[PDB]
Chain A
Amino acid sequence: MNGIPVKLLNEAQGHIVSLELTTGATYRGKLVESEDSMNVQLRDVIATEPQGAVTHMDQIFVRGSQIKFIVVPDLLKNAPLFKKNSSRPMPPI
């Protein structure tokens, strides 16, 4: 399945992220819902074109394979996904 980083992207739902795209566009806004395939949907999006302008989308849906990176907020530095030793409470049967 997923692996740690896209699990983090599944964690940072509804919080102010910033995306660069491969075009150089860095969308920024609240993260409505990410998928496992890194297609991410965003709201109140403020966009920076490659030309240097800035605009405001309301409701964007950027495809995963043109994301350059994504920045989540800082606090997720401390996240239970990163805990190397948290033991599993008897998986279901």
Chain B
Amino acid sequence: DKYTALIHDENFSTLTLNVSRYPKSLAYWEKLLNYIVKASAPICKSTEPQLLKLIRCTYSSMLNEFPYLENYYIDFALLEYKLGNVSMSHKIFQRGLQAFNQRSLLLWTSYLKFCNNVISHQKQLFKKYETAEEYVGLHFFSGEFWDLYLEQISSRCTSSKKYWNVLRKILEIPLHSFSKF
């Protein structure tokens, strides 16, 4: 009922017209965002499926309208995650990475901090870090990415040998926070 209650509120309609008149005005679209989610409930599976399809399609039009939004990639992927549908959240961050031609570190560190908790299979999970590493490892402020990777490869392996490889790989790279490593 709160779906239809959102429809029949005039605030949503006026602001909807404001926005659909103007695509690349971000600040209109931000109020569109804030109205939809803040006017909605605490978002769980109990909420109405029409409203959830609305939030999904809303961010999909957003994200395909402004493809260089890191934070709204994270916001759609995590809000979509809280419902469940982990496989879709993987598809979402991978759509984001494909929009950043698999670069730019923030999507990487957050996808990967996410991916620690989701994916279980070690060889593959480290392979995913490796594909991440050849794309955004050399990045100058990429210290958080490595720190993530080093704490991780310290956690799962038993032999230290795989960890020494990465330590010897760090210090060659000109990182910003080299000095922690």
Contact between chain A and chain B defined by CB under 8 Å: yes
B86 interface residue (CB < 8 Å to A): yes
Q: Which residues of A contact B (CB under 8 A)?
A: 46, 48, 53-58
B99 interface residue (CB < 8 Å to A): no
Given A48-B120, A53-B87, 15 additional A-B pairs, CB 8 A = A46-B86, A46-B117, A46-B118, A54-B86, A54-B87, A54-B118, A54-B120, A55-B85, A55-B86, A56-B81, A56-B82, A56-B84, A56-B86, A57-B84, A58-B82
**What 1/0 flags go to B101-137 for Cβ under 8 Å of A?**
0000000000000000110100000000000000000
B44 interface residue (CB < 8 Å to A): yes
What are 18 A-B contacts defined by CB distance under 8 Å?
A: A46-B86, A46-B117, A46-B118, A48-B120, A54-B86, A54-B87, A54-B118, A54-B120, A55-B84, A55-B85, A55-B86, A56-B81, A56-B82, A56-B84, A56-B86, A57-B84, A58-B44, A58-B82
Closest partner residue, chain A, to B90 (CB atom): A54
A53 to B85 Cα, complex, angstroms: 10
* Residues in B whose Cβ lies below 8 Å from that of A53: 87
Minimum CB–CB distance from B86 to chain A (whole Å) comes to 5
A54 to B87 Cα, complex, angstroms: 8
Minimum CB–CB distance from B149 to chain A (whole Å) comes to 20
A57 to B82 Cα, complex, angstroms: 8
* Residues in A whose Cβ lies below 8 Å from that of B86: 46, 54-56
Minimum CB–CB distance from A92 to chain B (whole Å) comes to 44
* Residues in B whose Cβ lies below 8 Å from that of A48: 120
A8 to B169 Cα, complex, angstroms: 42
* Residues in B whose Cβ lies below 8 Å from that of A57: 84
Minimum CB–CB distance from A44 to chain B (whole Å) comes to 8
A46 to B116 Cα, complex, angstroms: 12
Closest partner residue, chain A, to B45 (CB atom): A58
Minimum CB–CB distance from A77 to chain B (whole Å) comes to 16
Closest partner residue, chain A, to B83 (CB atom): A56
Minimum CB–CB distance from B3 to chain A (whole Å) comes to 21
* Residues in A whose Cβ lies below 8 Å from that of B44: 58
